[PDB]
Design a protein around this ligand. Structure first.
Ligand SMILES: CCC(CC)CN(C[C@@H](O)[C@H](Cc1ccccc1)NC(=O)O[C@H]1CO[C@H]2OCC[C@H]21)S(=O)(=O)c1ccc(CO)cc1
Lengths: 99, 99
């Protein structure tokens, strides 16, 4: 689809078998989701945003479906204000900016 | 143009008579620029993201030229680590997401 930006680009995602809402975020290198239980091993990591750095759980090679488009990649879980889909998965679904 | 997301979507902008590099950020409601001395009146504001909040100065009706496309609207100024072009100006230059 073509998505205009007069509203937040929110989409439904499916991860770990559960549906959630997420923000398509071209300003995020990484995908960061709010606290949730995910299967598989994880490693502690740190990521920095506009307000400072937070600790996250890094899940590698996680299956995640974004508006019916499949992606498999790194998902960070931690105290983010909003579920964000970052460029590491936006590239996998073929997302581009156009003007 | 069409911008892929393999790398950060940085473009050259013109504001207050200065050329800068800024992110085309669909995850940002409003535009936020690194510290700079703009003239005119402003209003204090706090904006939040990963890591917490920063204090910024809100200027209204600021002209920014993004890759030759003119846009005028709210520009926040504060200690952000990156210049961020948010949706309030992305819509004005005709920017869309596509996949
Ligand atoms: C509330 C939703 C977003 C935060 C969750 C909003 N952000 C824009 C986002 O694109 C930032 C923009 C950004 C980019 C680099 C450094 C600071 C902020 N990217 C970001 O935080 O990505 C992190 C995950 O991937 C990594 O790679 C970049 C940092 C990490 S934000 O910078 O905090 C922000 C911007 C403008 C406003 C005013 O409307 C309010 C918040």
């Amino acid at each position: 689809p073509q998505i205009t930006l007069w509203k937040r680009p929110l989409v439904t995602i499916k991860i770990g078998g559960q549906l959630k809402e997420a923000l398509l975020d071209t300003g995020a290198d990484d995908t960061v989701l709010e606290e949730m239980n995910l299967p598989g091993r994880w490693k502690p990591k740190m990521i920095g945003g506009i307000g400072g750095f937070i600790k996250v759980r890094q899940y590698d090679q996680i299956l995640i479906e974004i508006c019916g488009h499949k992606a498999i990649g790194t998902v960070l879980v931690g105290p983010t204000p909003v579920n964000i889909i970052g460029r590491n998965l936006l590239t996998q679904i073929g997302c581009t900016l156009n003007f």
